[PDB]
């Protein structure tokens, strides 16, 4: 969301996902643990 307010700021996509999960009140530890599962589910939903 950085560039929205102005200058764009490079960030890792995983870091962004962790920040979103914090936004919905979820700990990033699970996200890091299950990166593979989240990515697979996301890709499957995209195909669907």
């Amino acid at each position: 969301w950085t560039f929205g307010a102005g200058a764009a700021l490079q960030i890792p996509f995983a870091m962004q996902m962790a920040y979103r999960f914090n936004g919905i009140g979820v700990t990033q530890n699970v996200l890091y643990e299950n990166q593979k599962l989240i990515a697979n589910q996301f890709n499957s939903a995209i195909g669907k």
């Binding site: 995983a14 870091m15 920040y19 700990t27 990033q28 530890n29 890091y32 643990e33 990166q35």
Partner: protein
């Protein structure tokens, strides 16, 4: 995240940052580097699971205090007995 003793430490808030020489944590919206310590971060799991983690020591504020009390007690009651 970071590994100190085979365990994964993550920032409570902010983000880790390093321009080489050293590692710090700071609030995301302002460049305010800070020493990473126990209170700054929190533990979760071990190192292997995550991807891209790196290594660094995590300082404990309580340890130097109890070490001062150790200097007072451990090495003063030595030879009187």
């Amino acid at each position: 995240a970071i590994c100190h003793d085979g365990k994964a430490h993550f920032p409570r808030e902010g983000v880790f940052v390093s321009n080489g020489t050293h590692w710090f944590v700071t609030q995301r919206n302002f460049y305010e580097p800070q020493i990473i310590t126990t209170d700054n971060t929190f533990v979760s799991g071990n190192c292997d699971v995550v991807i891209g983690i790196v290594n660094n020591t995590v300082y404990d504020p309580l340890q130097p205090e109890l070490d001062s009390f150790k200097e007072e007690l451990d090495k003063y009651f030595k030879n009187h007995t």
